Amino acid sequence: VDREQLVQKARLAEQAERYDDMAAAMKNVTELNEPLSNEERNLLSVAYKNVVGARRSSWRVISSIEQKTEKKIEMVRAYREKIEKELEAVCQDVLSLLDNYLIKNCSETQYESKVFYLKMKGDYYRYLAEVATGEKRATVVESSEKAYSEAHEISKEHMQPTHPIRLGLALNYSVFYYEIQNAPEQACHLAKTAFDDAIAELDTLNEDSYKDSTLIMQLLRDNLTLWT
Amino acid sequence: VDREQLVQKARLAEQAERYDDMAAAMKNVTELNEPLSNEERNLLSVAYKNVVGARRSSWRVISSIEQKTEKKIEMVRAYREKIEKELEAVCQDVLSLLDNYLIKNCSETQYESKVFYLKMKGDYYRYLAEVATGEKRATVVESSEKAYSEAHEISKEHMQPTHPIRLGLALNYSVFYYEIQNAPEQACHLAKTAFDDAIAELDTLNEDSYKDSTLIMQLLRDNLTLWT
Amino acid sequence: DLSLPFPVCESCPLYKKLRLST
Amino acid sequence: DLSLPFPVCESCPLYKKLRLST
Numbered sequence: 001v002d003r004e005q006l007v008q009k010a011r012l013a014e015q016a017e018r019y020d021d022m023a024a025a026m027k028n029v030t031e032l033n034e035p036l037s038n039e040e041r042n043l044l045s046v047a048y049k050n051v052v053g054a055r056r057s058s059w060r061v062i063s064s065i066e067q068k069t070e071k072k073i074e075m076v077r078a079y080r081e082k083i084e085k086e087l088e089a090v091c092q093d094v095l096s097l098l099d100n101y102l103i104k105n106c107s108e109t110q111y112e113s114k115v116f117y118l119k120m121k122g123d124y125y126r127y128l129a130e131v132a133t134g135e136k137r138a139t140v141v142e143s144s145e146k147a148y149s150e151a152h153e154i155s156k157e158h159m160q161p162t163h164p165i166r167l168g169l170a171l172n173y174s175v176f177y178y179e180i181q182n183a184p185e186q187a188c189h190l191a192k193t194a195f196d197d198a199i200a201e202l203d204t205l206n207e208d209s210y211k212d213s214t215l216i217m218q219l220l221r222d223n224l225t226l227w228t
Numbered sequence: 229v230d231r232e233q234l235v236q237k238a239r240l241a242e243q244a245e246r247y248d249d250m251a252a253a254m255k256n257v258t259e260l261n262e263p264l265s266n267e268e269r270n271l272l273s274v275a276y277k278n279v280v281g282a283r284r285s286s287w288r289v290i291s292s293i294e295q296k297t298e299k300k301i302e303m304v305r306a307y308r309e310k311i312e313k314e315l316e317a318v319c320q321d322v323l324s325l326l327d328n329y330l331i332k333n334c335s336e337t338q339y340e341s342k343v344f345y346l347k348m349k350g351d352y353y354r355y356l357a358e359v360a361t362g363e364k365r366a367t368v369v370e371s372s373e374k375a376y377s378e379a380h381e382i383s384k385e386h387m388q389p390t391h392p393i394r395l396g397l398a399l400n401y402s403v404f405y406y407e408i409q410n411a412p413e414q415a416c417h418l419a420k421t422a423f424d425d426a427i428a429e430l431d432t433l434n435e436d437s438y439k440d441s442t443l444i445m446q447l448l449r450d451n452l453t454l455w456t
Numbered sequence: 457d458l459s460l461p462f463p464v465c466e467s468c469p470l471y472k473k474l475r476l477s478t
Numbered sequence: 479d480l481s482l483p484f485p486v487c488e489s490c491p492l493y494k495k496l497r498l499s500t
């Protein structure tokens with residue numbers, strides 16, 4: 001199997017809603033040890049987002065059952081812990097791909113890729129933080145903030161305020177402050193600043209991405225409305 | 229882990245939409261080599277129905293892509309075959325549980341269980357028939373008909389026409405004739421006879437199952453309306 | 457799919473059975 | 479979930495992005 005067939009397999013797996021297969025295919029593509037195209041980047045992200053998302057959804061269901069309820073609670077807690085370990089394994093898989101391939105071999109001028117991958121790194125440490133406790137949680141919360149903040153600095157310097165990757169970073173970084181750090185003022189400032197910076201430079205919208213830009217601006221406004 | 233904890237795990241897995249886990253739990257319960265309660269029967273059926281159903285859905289998506297489209301068609305066909313083998317493995321897993329435990333150790337007076345398990349056997353051979361070709365298809369089609377017809381004879385003799393397991397058997401047996409055997413006249417006769425026999429004996433509806441009975445009667449009527 | 461779409465047991469709510477059937 | 483719900487690429491139809499966002 002060559003790279004073209006692996007990417008085709010990922011596309012087929014996505015259509016069949018077999019996201020474990022999709023992630024394995026795109027992990028294999030990454031492990032060819034060459035950079036990812038924009039499409040390969042998106043396929044990798046979609047794959048792992050859906051894999052981890054199934055675990056996140058299941059974890060929230062079992063955690064809610066654990067709060068609402070002898071050998072029964074022992075099984076509920078053990079099952080939650082089983083799902084937790086699966087979720088953590090998926091996140092560490094992604095983070096290893098990011099740290100050892102994707103961020104590692106980014107060129108100096110590939111600012112969009114660096115922001116994309118650093119945002120992903122922030123995302124997956126944030127998913128770890130959702131289920132972590134104690135000192136383990138403090139470590140992954142710190143790692144999430146470090147990745148988001150570096151992505152934010154790079155995107156501030158090298159990307160237009162309407163660029164959809166910069167806007168989506170602000171969206172998720174603000175969510176990190178609201179949900180993980182319990183810091184609604186900082187979350188609102190991040191979201192409002194990104195929205196305002198985009199609307200002030202509306203003339204920088206690109207023909208190939210203006211739909212994503214304007215939609216993510218609405219998602220930012222949605223969260224600000226919910227939070228204020 | 230004891231039987232009570234395995235069934236609790238199956239219930240938790242269902243709530244978390246982790247049907248592979250649910251099926252593995254109920255397979256373990258079956259392999260304790262004791263009969264299944266009505267609830268354990270339903271948990272086993274729901275588990276495997278959802279496992280095989282994901283494969284059926286994926287197979288139909290990839291098969292439609294294979295019809296609509298060098299190394300590309302080789303990958304689409306190979307991926308379809310991968311999903312096919314997974315689907316067949318799930319069905320053979322179920323059929324082994326039915327043939328070697330559940331049907332095998334049914335008591336003489338457990339007519340409801342025998343019909344339930346023989347219907348399941350017909351169902352999973354029918355799922356095999358959906359993806360099989362040539363002589364392999366003829367074999368599983370024959371096996372599906374043999375299981376459904378024996379279930380039908382038993383249900384005719386020992387169950388009320390309004391019993392929801394008897395009605396659901398007629399529903400699926402009629403679908404077998406329509407979809408697998410390309411026999412719409414026989415499919416309609418099976419569905420209409422079951423509906424008519426139920427409505428003629430409406431006074432046999434049970435307080436604990438009249439909702440299932442009346443709903444499956446509507447499903448039978450729905451198919452007859454679609455087919456006539 | 458035209459086959460039986462829900463489990464035959466009372467512990468499954470009717471609303472769930474109707475959603476599976478439609 | 480309040481985070482970005484869709485992939486940022488043109489090959490994903492807008493209708494899909496709107497459904498993921500709502």
Ligand SMILES: OC(C(F)(F)F)C(F)(F)F
Pocket residue numbers: 014039042043044046047485486487488489490491
């Ligand atoms: O979801 C795919 C991805 F991953 F964004 F490339 C699609 F190509 F379909 F958009």
Ligand SMILES: OC(C(F)(F)F)C(F)(F)F
Pocket residue numbers: 215218219222496499500
């Ligand atoms: O959430 C927005 C709404 F409400 F659907 F308009 C969005 F446009 F982003 F989907």
Ligand SMILES: OC(C(F)(F)F)C(F)(F)F
Pocket residue numbers: 242267270271272274275463464465466467468469
């Ligand atoms: O789906 C369950 C089953 F399997 F039918 F028992 C429920 F108990 F929830 F109905």
Ligand SMILES: OC(C(F)(F)F)C(F)(F)F
Pocket residue numbers: 443446447450474477478
């Ligand atoms: O299909 C029937 C309908 F149409 F929803 F009424 C059923 F009652 F069975 F759901």
